[PDB]
Amino acid sequence: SMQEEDTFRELRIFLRNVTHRLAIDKRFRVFTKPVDPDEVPDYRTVIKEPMDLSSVISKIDLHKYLTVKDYLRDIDLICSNALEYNPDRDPGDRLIRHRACALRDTAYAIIKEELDEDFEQLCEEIQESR
Numbered sequence: 455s456m457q458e459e460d461t462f463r464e465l466r467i468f469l470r471n472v473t474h475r476l477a478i479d480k481r482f483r484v485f486t487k488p489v490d491p492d493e494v495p496d497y498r499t500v501i502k503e504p505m506d507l508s509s510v511i512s513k514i515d516l517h518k519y520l521t522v523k524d525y526l527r528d529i530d531l532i533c534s535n536a537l538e539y540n541p542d543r544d545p546g547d548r549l550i551r552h553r554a555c556a557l558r559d560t561a562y563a564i565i566k567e568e569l570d571e572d573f574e575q576l577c578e579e580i581q582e583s584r
């Protein structure tokens with residue numbers, strides 16, 4: 455129905471706004487673009503499903519997300535990819551892991567404050583009807 459298409463359009467507006475607020479934070483610069491094959495040719499042999507915030511905006515606009523739960527699966531993949539690729543005790547690995555961690559926790563805290571639970575449940579019930 456047109457009412458259901460207005461629901462998904464409001465979801466996309468909400469997801470674009472959260473993603474922009476993450477992408478401008480200086481801590482999260484390393485998560486804003488795909489890893490460069492040249493600089494790191496090993497990355498795509500270890501990490502089987504790369505993800506970054508530029509790819510997330512493109513996915514919003516392609517109508518890939520019909521719920522906030524499916525958006526958060528991609529934010530969780532950004533933060534699990536960085537934990538798995540950079541697991542060592544040295545300062546450079548520890549700095550990306552504390553930050554990858556800060557990106558996950560910040561996304562979940564904005565959603566807990568600003569997403570209405572009944573809006574999410576509506577999106578879930580429209581998705582489950584299709």
Ligand SMILES: CCOC(=O)CNC(=O)[C@H](C)c1cc(C)ccn1
Nearest residue numbers: 537538541542548549551552553555
């Ligand atoms: C203060 C530096 O930042 C942190 O310690 C943030 N948390 C992590 O790195 C978690 C515990 C972790 C560690 C490892 C070895 C593998 C997967 N996750």
